[PDB]
Design a protein around this ligand. Structure first.
Ligand code: NA
Lengths: 128, 129
């Protein structure tokens, strides 16, 4: 069901990790300060863990989602920054997997959308 | 440039308002209570008004953004509900536009909406922070 996307992530973990770390770092340069590379790499790795627990849907990864959202809040990432990052993550995955295009986009969207919206929810909850 | 998407929104305002109002309503049916048709219509209208100010970026609609997000909080829409709704809003606009490359249309749509929606999510969360 989410097999094509899931399997690609599983098979391309090391390259995704680097890709997404680099995405966090690039976005951070637009912010008033930049955390260290290891901090962004750990966020990336936690995220990938979430994706690999989320083959069915966002439910299995409940505890890691809550941890990641709390961590984001605690270390000073805005919702704006996190949402921007997560949007860029799936788009950079697309470029990797694309390499029909439209059906791939919809595959990616079906796997990620509920994960990301649950992460957003738990970020807001970790203030609410 | 966001000209292509902006123009389609500008030319199809009444249609989009109905489409988005219906999406909200459909989604509300899975929540523990439903608000009124007018409440959801007013949300769709406030959102479209944001879009029409946003041809460059999300900055001109700062105040409108902040008001929409705050109202969402106050009326009891979760972030989950809001983020699901907004995702469906662009996807439904895609189906409309696409039926008039598909891939480049999606990226045009994403380019326009993504910074607006992220800013909405931010103001939603900030209402609590
Ligand atoms: Na767990």
């Amino acid at each position: 069901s989410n097999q094509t996307v899931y399997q690609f992530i599983a098979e391309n973990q090391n390259e995704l990790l680097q890709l997404w770390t680099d995405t966090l770092k690039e976005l951070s340069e637009q912010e008033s300060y930049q955390l260290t590379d290891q901090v962004y790499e750990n966020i990336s790795k936690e995220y990938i863990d979430i994706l690999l627990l989320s083959v069915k849907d966002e439910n299995a990864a409940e505890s890691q989602i809550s941890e990641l959202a709390l961590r984001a809040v605690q270390i000073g990432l805005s919702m704006k920054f996190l949402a921007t990052a997560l949007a860029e993550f799936w788009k950079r995955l697309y470029t990797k997997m694309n390499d029909e295009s439209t059906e791939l986009i919809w595959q990616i969207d079906r796997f990620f959308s509920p994960i990301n919206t649950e992460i957003f929810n738990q970020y807001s909850i970790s203030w609410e």
